[PDB]
Amino acid sequence: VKTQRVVITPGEPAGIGPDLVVQLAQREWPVELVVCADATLLTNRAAMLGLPLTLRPYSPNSPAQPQTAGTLTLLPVALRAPVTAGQLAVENGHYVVETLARACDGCLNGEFAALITGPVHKGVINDAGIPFTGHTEFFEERSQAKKVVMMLATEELRVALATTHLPLRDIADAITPALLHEVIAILHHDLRTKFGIAEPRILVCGLNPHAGEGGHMGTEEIDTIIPVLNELRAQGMKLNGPLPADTLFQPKYLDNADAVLAMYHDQGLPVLKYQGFGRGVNITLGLPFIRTSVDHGTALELAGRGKADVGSFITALNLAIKMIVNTQ
Amino acid sequence: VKTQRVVITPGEPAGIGPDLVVQLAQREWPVELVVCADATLLTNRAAMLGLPLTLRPYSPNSPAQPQTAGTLTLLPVALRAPVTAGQLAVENGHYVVETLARACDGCLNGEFAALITGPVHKGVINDAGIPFTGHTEFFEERSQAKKVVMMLATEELRVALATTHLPLRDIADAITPALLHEVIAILHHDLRTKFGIAEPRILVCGLNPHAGEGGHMGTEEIDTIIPVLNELRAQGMKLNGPLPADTLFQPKYLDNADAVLAMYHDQGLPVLKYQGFGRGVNITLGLPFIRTSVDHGTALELAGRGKADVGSFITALNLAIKMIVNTQ
Ligand SMILES: [Zn+2]
Ligand SMILES: [Zn+2]
């Protein structure tokens, strides 16, 4: 058994990502933590927080070593400008993108067994003149990925999104048998080859309230959702639904599921966040590599202060680690 | 003080409403429970359930008296045909609607402090040639209500819906300033006049994920929601601007708010359903009187069997009582 390596991108320097990473470093880890970021950034922030940090260099041509408490391994990318916690900085936009580009490739190459990302600020990135829609779009394109799927998981509750950040008004047309087949395939595949579930049991939400109540609140379940499930169920895939989302989200139903397929953003996330502030993880399915992320944003306001909550990041790390195990 | 009267309509005689009312009658009550139903119907169901029941006649020309355990007060209405649990009898559709009419007028004329409804079967009512768009629409109409707002509550969380049963594709255009202005007005009005919450605190969801995230993920928050909210804030209403639905159901917000206002069905009820077990209550806002209701169907299958579950009915009644006492 060879010790594995994982790359972490704290993301937005002015954000709380660097803080959270310093806290992560305060413990033992079965894998080596290769943090792609500015050393000075990590050093100062650590200092402000009052937490000891010791960076050791990324040595690719050497056996990997589990990261020991108070330490992290470094894969440097330099800040384009100095950093003051709490205040953004347009140019650091290229820095954030740099570390994201370096980490992705590392996983595309094979240097790292997984990528766990910290919160980034899109705005600042775009203002710096860089085309950026979010991590899930960045890693998707840079990997030449046919299509991915987003998931937010806690422990026993995993929710997948057929469509993501689309205005409410454009959802209906977006859900087509084409979208659904690609989607469920990647979901079912990954629940098996990543989460290690032999026979994944997916619950499926209907597009409409009450799953369209057949005759009344919509025909999308009759025209595209049901036919596709009828196909995949016949292929031995276990798919329960379309079910009204406000019936499906009960333990009587959940305690017998491996995951939930929500048709859109607000149909599945509200219950998840409610279910776990800390513990949630966003996992990108479909990517040519294991990638998880936190469930929160940059929280500039709390940066450098000394109060964080690495709960999500830690969870995203642990899960990234388990997936390694189930994918090795 | 004086004892308050509430009126309860068990509803469809063949369903669980009657079993439920008998069950709720096994404990003491701070108010007189005037049940608008058939005497023999309640007594038979109580005997089949092995539960004691002693009816005393409703007598308006007398002081109300807190209901004693094992008893109920009765506002008689003759069934049209005998009743057999689990079997719909169309001639009895007139009985059901007659109890709704009687309880309704009772509330409208000051006889009763509130109305608490058990499940009703629309199918059998229409089958008897009786127009019935719905249980809550019936009261909406009999009381010349300009408009009603549906709320789902759990004695811990209150969720109002700007729009209910509509195909997902129709919500976007359905949310006009006109609709939103009114819905909020009634919500705010009733939290104050029916819940007794002087100066109510309301959290409003945005229509799109991330509440629009500027104008790059939905233009409605800018086009109609925020404009309507600012105006309403001028009126002195404490409205907490369009928030992302996925992060609104966090304790930091909920614990310091009196109600949430979702733009649509699946955006607000799933959390409510998840955090509710069965204690979900249906509250109809905008009527000239207080009205609470169970969050379930008639369950003909369970009728008479003895294994109902009075969770919803007890909450509905306890909530209606809390509302009464909190507004005397
Ligand atoms: Zn999102
Ligand atoms: Zn509904």
Side-chain angles (χ1 to χ4, degrees), chain A residues 2 21 27 52 57 64 83-85 91 95 111 114 118 133 142 144 151 194 201 207 211 241 257 259 263 269 272 310:
Chain A
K2 192 166 190 174
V21 161
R27 57 183 71 184
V83 174
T84 311
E91 298 310 353
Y95 158 75
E111 292 176 69
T133 8
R142 195 181 182 69
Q144 298 187 68
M151 177 184 275
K194 269 189 178 186
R201 308 164 293 180
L207 176 60
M263 286 300 116
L269 299 194
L272 212 310
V310 67

Side-chain angles (χ1 to χ4, degrees), chain A residues 241-274 276 278 280-294 296-299:
Chain A
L243 285 178
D246 68 304
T247 283
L248 175 162
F249 280 104
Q250 281 171 290
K252 58 174 294 172
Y253 281 95
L254 300 172
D255 299 345
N256 290 310
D258 296 330
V260 182
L261 179 61
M263 286 300 116
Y264 58 90
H265 202 267
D266 287 350
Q267 170 170 251
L269 299 194
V271 140
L272 212 310
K273 304 300 186 63
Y274 173 95
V281 182
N282 162 192
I283 306 102
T284 304
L285 307 175
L287 279 185
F289 60 83
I290 308 174
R291 184 274 171 145
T292 65
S293 176
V294 282
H296 60 281
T298 59

